[PDB]
Amino acid sequence: KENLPLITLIVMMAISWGLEQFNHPFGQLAFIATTLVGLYPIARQALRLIKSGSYFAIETLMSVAAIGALFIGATAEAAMVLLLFLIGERLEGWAASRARQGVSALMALKPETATRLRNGEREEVAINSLRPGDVIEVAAGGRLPADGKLLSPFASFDESALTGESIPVERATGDKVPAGATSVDRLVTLEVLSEPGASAIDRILKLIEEAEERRAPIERFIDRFSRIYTPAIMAVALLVTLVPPLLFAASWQEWIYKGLTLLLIGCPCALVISTPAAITSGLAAAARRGALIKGGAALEQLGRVTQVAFDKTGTLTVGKPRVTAIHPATGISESELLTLAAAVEQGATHPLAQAIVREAQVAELAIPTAESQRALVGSGIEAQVNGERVLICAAGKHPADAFAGLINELESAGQTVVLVVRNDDVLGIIALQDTLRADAATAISELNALGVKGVILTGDNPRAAAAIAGELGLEFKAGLLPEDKVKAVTKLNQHAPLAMVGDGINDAPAMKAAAIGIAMGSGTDVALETADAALTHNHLRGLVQMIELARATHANIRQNITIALGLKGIFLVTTLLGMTGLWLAVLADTGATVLVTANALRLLR
Ligand code: BEF
Ligand SMILES: [Mg+2]
Numbered sequence: 230k231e232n233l234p235l236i237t238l239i240v241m242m243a244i245s246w247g248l249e250q251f252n253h254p255f256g257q258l259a260f261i262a263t264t265l266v267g268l269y270p271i272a273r274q275a276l277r278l279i280k281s282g283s284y285f286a287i288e289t290l291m292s293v294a295a296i297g298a299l300f301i302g303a304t305a306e307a308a309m310v311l312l313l314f315l316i317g318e319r320l321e322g323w324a325a326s327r328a329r330q331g332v333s334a335l336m337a338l339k340p341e342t343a344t345r346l347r348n349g350e351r352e353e354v355a356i357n358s359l360r361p362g363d364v365i366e367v368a369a370g371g372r373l374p375a376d377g378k379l380l381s382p383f384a385s386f387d388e389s390a391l392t393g394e395s396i397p398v399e400r401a402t403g404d405k406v407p408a409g410a411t412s413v414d415r416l417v418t419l420e421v422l423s424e425p426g427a428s429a430i431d432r433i434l435k436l437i438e439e440a441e442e443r444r445a446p447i448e449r450f451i452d453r454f455s456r457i458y459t460p461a462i463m464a465v466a467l468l469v470t471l472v473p474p475l476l477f478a479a480s481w482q483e484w485i486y487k488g489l490t491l492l493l494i495g496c497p498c499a500l501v502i503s504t505p506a507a508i509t510s511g512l513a514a515a516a517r518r519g520a521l522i523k524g525g526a527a528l529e530q531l532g533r534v535t536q537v538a539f540d541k542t543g544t545l546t547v548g549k550p551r552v553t554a555i556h557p558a559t560g561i562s563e564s565e566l567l568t569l570a571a572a573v574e575q576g577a578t579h580p581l582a583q584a585i586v587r588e589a590q591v592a593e594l595a596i597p598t599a600e601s602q603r604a605l606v607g608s609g610i611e612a613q614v615n616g617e618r619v620l621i622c623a624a625g626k627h628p629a630d631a632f633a634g635l636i637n638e639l640e641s642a643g644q645t646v647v648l649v650v651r652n653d654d655v656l657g658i659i660a661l662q663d664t665l666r667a668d669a670a671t672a673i674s675e676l677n678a679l680g681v682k683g684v685i686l687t688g689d690n691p692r693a694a695a696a697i698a699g700e701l702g703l704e705f706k707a708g709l710l711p712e713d714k715v716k717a718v719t720k721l722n723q724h725a726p727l728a729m730v731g732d733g734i735n736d737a738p739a740m741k742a743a744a745i746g747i748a749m750g751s752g753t754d755v756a757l758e759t760a761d762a763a764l765t766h767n768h769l770r771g772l773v774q775m776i777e778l779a780r781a782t783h784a785n786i787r788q789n790i791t792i793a794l795g796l797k798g799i800f801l802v803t804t805l806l807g808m809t810g811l812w813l814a815v816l817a818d819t820g821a822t823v824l825v826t827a828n829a830l831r832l833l834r
Contacts, residue, residue, distance in 0.1 A: 235319055238267055242312055245305070260304035267311040268295050287455040287501075293463065294496040297489040306493065313498040313822070317505030324512045325524045332521050332763045336754050343374040346418065356425075363421040369578065372410040375428050377419025379404045383607045385579065387411040390733040390753050391429060393542045393688030395663040396550065396645050397580060399608040399623060409734065414579045414604060430755075433711050436738035437759055440715055444741060447526050450786055451504040466492040494801065499793030499822035504786055506829035511782030514832045520771045520778075522762035527745055531762070531779030534726040534744050537676060537683045537772070538718055541697050541705075543732030544749045545685065545769075546665045550580050552588040553644055554660035556635060564594060566657040570649050571596040573612040573621050577604070581647065582621075584661050620650040629655040643696030665697055672769035673701050679776060684721075686714045688735050714739035730764075730772065731756055747772070778832070785832055789825040796821045 241263040249256020272295070275288035291311060298307040345354045346364045356374045359365070364380065367373055385397045390410040397413050400406055406419065407429030423429070448456075470488030473479040508525035515522055522528045539545045555563040571589035574582035575596055589596050600613040609622025620627070629636065629648050632655055639646050644660040673683060685698050685705035694707035706717055711734075718739045721727050726744040729736065732752050737759035740746025748760030750767050757763055764771045800817040804810060813820060 235315065238263065238312060238315070241266065242305075242308055245308070257304060260308055261299075264295060264299060264304050264308040264311060267308060267315060268292070268299075271311060271315065272296075283452075285456050285459045286452050287459065290455050290459040290496055291501065293459075294493045298493040301486055301489055303490075303493060310496055310498045310501055314501045317502045317509075320509045321505040321512075321525050324509045328512055328516060328521050329523050331516070332523065332748075332757055332760070335750055335752070335757050335763060335765065339754060341374075344368075359421050359423075359425070361421050361424055364418060365421055366416065366418050367412050368416050369412050369414050371412055373406060373408050373412075373419065375408045375419075375421045376423035377406050377408075378422055379406055380418045380420050381415075382605070384415055384417045385413050385608065387413050387580070389542050389548050391433070391735060393540060393733060393735055395542050395546070395548065395689050395693045396661075401607070414577060430734060433734050433738065434755070436711055436715065437741055437755070440738050440742045447530070449504070449526060450529055450783070454790070462492060462495040466495070494797065495794075497793055497797040497818050497821060499797070499818065499825040500790050501793075502822055503789035503793050503825050503829075506789055506825055507782050507785040507832070510829040510832040511778060511785065514834070515775060515778045515782075517833070518771065518774050518778075519766045519768055520762060520764055520775045522775070522779075524761075527761040528779060528782055530726065530744050531728070531775060532781070532783035533779075534728045534776065535681055536721055536725050536727040537681055538686045538714075538721065538727055538729045538739070538743070539683060539703075540714070540731045540733070540736050541665075541685055541687045541694065542663065542689055543751060544730055544736075545669055545701075546663045546697060548732070549664060550584040550645070550661040551664045552584055552659060553662045554639060554646075555588075555657070556632070556659070557657040558631070558655060561657060564592065566649055566659070567592070568594045568596060569614060569619060569651075569656065570621055570647075570659060572598050572614045573602065573610060573619050575599060576602060577610060579610075581645070581661055582610070585647075585659065617651050620648075622648055622650070624648075627655070629658065631655070632658050641692060643690075643692035643694070662696065663693060665700060666767065666769055668768055668770045670701060672773060673703065675770060675773040676776075679773065681776065684717075686717055686729075686736075686739065688714075711735040711738045715742045718743045728772070728776075731760075747775070781832060785829055788828050792828060793821045793825050796824075 245256060245259035245263050248259060271288050272292040275286065275292040278286045278288065291314060295307040295311050341356050343354055343356050343359060344351050344366045345359065346366050351366065359375055365375065365377060379400050379402055383401055385399045386406055387397050388394060388407060388410050391407055405422065408423055409430045466488045469491055470484045473484045474481045508528060511528055512522055512525055515528065522531060542548050555567055557563055557566040567589055571586045574585045598614045602612040604610045608626050609620050611618060611620040624646060627648055627650055636646055636658060639660040644662050646658050646660045648658055649656045676683060683703050685694060685703050686709065687694050687705065687707050688709055689707060691707035694705045698705040714736060715738045718727060718729055719742050722743045729740050729743045729746045731740060731746065732749045734753050734755050737755050740759045745761040746759055748756040748763045750763060750765040752760065797818055800813045804814055
């Protein structure tokens with residue numbers, strides 16, 4: 230396992246070193262060879278970047294530096310820096326490879342396939358074999374394979390992955406429901422409207438790669454560094470070659486040699502080793518505490534952002550409801566109302582019913598009875614408790630005058646209220662609301678400690694938006710389509726680099742449109758794909774720990790650099806001012822490089 234192409238380079242360089250201690254002048258041919266063969270992929274890309282307007286990219290630096298000493302005597306030296314580079318590179322590529330498929334693990338792979346109901350019989354067609362007008366069946370807990378027109382009486386859906394809606398949607402006959410997610414209770418039958426590559430998920434899908442066909446290429450810390458440093462030394466090196474003969478009358482010879490020498494010594498094995506070291510270290514260190522950043526080029530951008538755009542449903546929150554308020558009619562206790570509700574709601578899979586039953590249990594309430602359980606009527610379920618017909622239904626699906634005002638109150642506060650009704654009397658009302666992640670609050674505060682302002686970008690209604698945003702200290706923009714998240718995000722990213730965090734599909738377009746997109750581990754597949762980094766665990770405090778780590782990495786890079794090239798500086802002069810000598814004499818670089826290894830490890834903790 231599994232690639233030996235580099236392995237040859239390590240061994241050619243070993244064979245060279247060896248047969249020079251005896252049989253000297255084939256040892257130098259050996260190096261010429263190994264230097265050249267290391268140089269071929271480097272010198273070649275350099276030329277490619279060159280042709281595409283990008284010169285002074287490094288591979289430029291070491292192509293020129295190698296080609297320099299390539300014949301002035303110093304082969305092993307140039308061979309060595311060339312060698313170290315393509316190693317550290319392979320290291321970093323091997324970290325990004327792990328990080329990517331590590332994310333690829335979270336992908337809970339789509340199964341595809343639909344169940345088309347034709348001549349009274351069901352067949353398992355392939356999704357793409359669907360035509361509009363086709364009648365399709367979707368079973369409870371199953372996502373839609375296409376945009377469908379609801380054919381069945383009543384049905385409720387979890388289309389939070391698309392719209393960011395916090396609560397299931399109660400749709401009726403002839404209503405439109407988009408592809409991808411999700412019948413929550415009840416087996417539904419739809420009629421296909423979407424044509425293959427044209428479902429709601431597809432329409433969102435092109436916005437992603439469209440926002441991609443708009444992305445700025447990524448200048449790395451080092452391509453951007455050598456963009457300055459490379460022509461710097463190249464310009465001086467040339468001039469240290471030219472000046473002495475011109476004035477002085479001195480052997481172009483001894484200054485050709487000195488010039489090219491300075492050029493090469495301007496590229497030690499370190500520094501070239503610097504940027505991969507910190508990246509390999511950072512990515513790994515960042516992965517330790519739960520955060521999988523893909524490419525190290527992404528990690529770089531991470532230590533550069535100062536803004537965050539969260540979405541709420543699923544990422545700031547949990548996308549599961551909890552009981553927030555119990556309000557009984559007069560002559561009843563919260564506990565009776567709640568237990569009577571739970572009696573009907575036991576069994577039911579609807580997220581709301583679950584939230585209710587949870588409530589009864591947490592409060593040490595023995596739930597009873599159950600007899601009928603008739604999930605019909607229209608957004609209401611009704612069962613038979615204690616001999617009576619008990620109805621639990623949604624908001625305005627039954628008159629509740631005595632409760633009207635209070636209902637409004639709750640509703641304006643971003644709360645969703647269900648009514649409990651025996652005979653034809655609202656025995657009382659219950660208010661529920663989506664729940665925010667535990668570490669959310671603290672996390673936000675922590676981000677502020679780092680000077681990172683946050684906003685909420687959600688497709689959910691502005692009341693739920695206001696509620697959650699209110700618990701935190703954040704601004705928000707609500708009811709907004711994926712395009713609007715993109716628009717808002719690109720509007721922000723102007724000022725300062727922004728990190729976008731999202732769960733569902735509607736965030737993915739906004740994700741490729743801003744510095745970095747981070748997907749929740751509970752994220753949708755397309756979100757996990759589009760994400761530049763993923764949070765396993767779904768811990769929001771990872772974000773802080775991300776940015777922190779990220780910035781350290783940025784610092785760490787430029788430390789390695791200034792030690793690497795830096796001590797190449799000093800011995801430079803020591804060996805050239807009559808010292809001449811000491812330890813460091815020739816050896817005092819490999820003394821850098823190792824510190825560049827070591828300093829890069831001040832990243833773990
Ligand atoms: F959860 Be997001 F609002 F799509
Ligand atoms: Mg979401």
